[PDB]
Scaffold this active site. Structure first.
Site, PDB file in Angstrom:
ATOM      1  N   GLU A  35      -0.301  14.900   6.938  1.00 41.89           N
ATOM      2  CA  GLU A  35       0.033  13.674   6.145  1.00 41.89           C
ATOM      3  C   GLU A  35       1.431  13.820   5.492  1.00 41.89           C
ATOM      4  O   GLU A  35       2.268  12.889   5.531  1.00 41.89           O
ATOM      5  CB  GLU A  35      -1.028  13.409   5.062  1.00 41.89           C
ATOM      6  CG  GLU A  35      -2.394  12.966   5.604  1.00 41.89           C
ATOM      7  CD  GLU A  35      -2.382  11.519   6.188  1.00 41.89           C
ATOM      8  OE1 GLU A  35      -1.376  10.774   6.052  1.00 41.89           O
ATOM      9  OE2 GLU A  35      -3.393  11.134   6.767  1.00 41.89           O
ATOM     10  N   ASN A  46       4.077   1.501   4.920  1.00 39.87           N
ATOM     11  CA  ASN A  46       3.227   0.974   5.998  1.00 39.87           C
ATOM     12  C   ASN A  46       3.699  -0.400   6.463  1.00 39.87           C
ATOM     13  O   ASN A  46       4.409  -1.098   5.715  1.00 39.87           O
ATOM     14  CB  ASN A  46       1.773   0.870   5.488  1.00 39.87           C
ATOM     15  CG  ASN A  46       1.229   2.201   5.009  1.00 39.87           C
ATOM     16  OD1 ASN A  46       0.666   2.312   3.913  1.00 39.87           O
ATOM     17  ND2 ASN A  46       1.394   3.221   5.829  1.00 39.87           N
ATOM     18  N   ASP A  48       2.282  -3.165   6.570  1.00 34.03           N
ATOM     19  CA  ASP A  48       1.802  -4.233   5.723  1.00 34.03           C
ATOM     20  C   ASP A  48       2.522  -4.346   4.384  1.00 34.03           C
ATOM     21  O   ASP A  48       2.159  -5.212   3.571  1.00 34.03           O
ATOM     22  CB  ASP A  48       0.270  -4.128   5.563  1.00 34.03           C
ATOM     23  CG  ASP A  48      -0.178  -2.952   4.640  1.00 34.03           C
ATOM     24  OD1 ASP A  48       0.641  -2.103   4.258  1.00 34.03           O
ATOM     25  OD2 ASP A  48      -1.364  -2.918   4.266  1.00 34.03           O
ATOM     26  N   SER A  50       2.537  -2.003   2.058  1.00 36.33           N
ATOM     27  CA  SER A  50       2.009  -0.983   1.175  1.00 36.33           C
ATOM     28  C   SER A  50       2.759   0.359   1.458  1.00 36.33           C
ATOM     29  O   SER A  50       3.503   0.472   2.428  1.00 36.33           O
ATOM     30  CB  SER A  50       0.482  -0.854   1.322  1.00 36.33           C
ATOM     31  OG  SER A  50       0.187  -0.234   2.552  1.00 36.33           O
ATOM     32  N   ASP A  52       2.371   4.777   1.237  1.00 33.75           N
ATOM     33  CA  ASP A  52       1.583   5.994   0.996  1.00 33.75           C
ATOM     34  C   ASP A  52       2.356   7.018   0.134  1.00 33.75           C
ATOM     35  O   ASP A  52       3.568   7.234   0.330  1.00 33.75           O
ATOM     36  CB  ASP A  52       1.237   6.674   2.330  1.00 33.75           C
ATOM     37  CG  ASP A  52       0.367   5.805   3.230  1.00 33.75           C
ATOM     38  OD1 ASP A  52      -0.304   4.845   2.771  1.00 33.75           O
ATOM     39  OD2 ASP A  52       0.355   6.112   4.423  1.00 33.75           O
ATOM     40  N   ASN A  59      -2.750   5.466  -0.460  1.00 35.32           N
ATOM     41  CA  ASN A  59      -2.092   4.209  -0.214  1.00 35.32           C
ATOM     42  C   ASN A  59      -2.168   3.227  -1.394  1.00 35.32           C
ATOM     43  O   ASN A  59      -3.204   3.098  -2.080  1.00 35.32           O
ATOM     44  CB  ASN A  59      -2.579   3.645   1.126  1.00 35.32           C
ATOM     45  CG  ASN A  59      -2.890   2.197   1.065  1.00 35.32           C
ATOM     46  OD1 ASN A  59      -3.962   1.793   0.582  1.00 35.32           O
ATOM     47  ND2 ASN A  59      -1.967   1.388   1.545  1.00 35.32           N
TER      48      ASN A  59
END
Ligand SMILES: [Cl-]
Ligand code: NA
Ligand code: NA
Length: 129
Positions: A35, A46, A48, A50, A52, A59
């Site tokens: 990650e 991301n 969308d 958003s 992380d 998120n």
């Protein structure tokens, strides 16, 4: 902070992740490696809108507040920047909430794709724990 593998396993163990909801420690180390490469400052946007944040790439659409994710939730009740600190307390507590949510560790795409079904014990091999 960029953690060493064994140093991260020990902090994860101390905060009670080893076998949390039946996921042995090497699962959490493996998820962290893919990650964030063990970097507490890692951020990734991301598609969308958003973002992380941190060692477990938690998120902003559901889990923390970054002030820029329209109509998101803040279920761990924390600013997302808290997840970037060299102390991982905030990430671990929030991760306990996520992993209890129904999908277990499948919530972490890199876990599902790169750790699940592999010999995750390897991730804590040689660690003085
Ligand atoms: Cl599960
Ligand atoms: Na393990
Ligand atoms: Na927001």
């Amino acid at each position: 902070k960029v953690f060493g593998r064994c140093e991260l396993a020990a902090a994860m163990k101390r905060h009670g992740l080893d076998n949390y909801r039946g996921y042995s420690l090497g699962n959490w180390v493996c998820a962290a490696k893919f990650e964030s490469n063990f970097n507490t400052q890692a951020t990734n946007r991301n598609t969308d809108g958003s973002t992380d944040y941190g060692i477990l790439q938690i998120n902003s659409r559901w889990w923390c507040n970054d002030g820029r994710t329209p109509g998101s939730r803040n279920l761990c009740n924390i600013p997302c920047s808290a997840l970037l600190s060299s102390d991982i307390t905030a990430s671990v507590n929030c991760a306990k909430k996520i992993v209890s949510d129904g999908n277990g560790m499948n919530a972490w795409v890199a876990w599902r794709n790169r750790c699940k079904g592999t010999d995750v014990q390897a991730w804590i091999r040689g660690c003085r724990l």
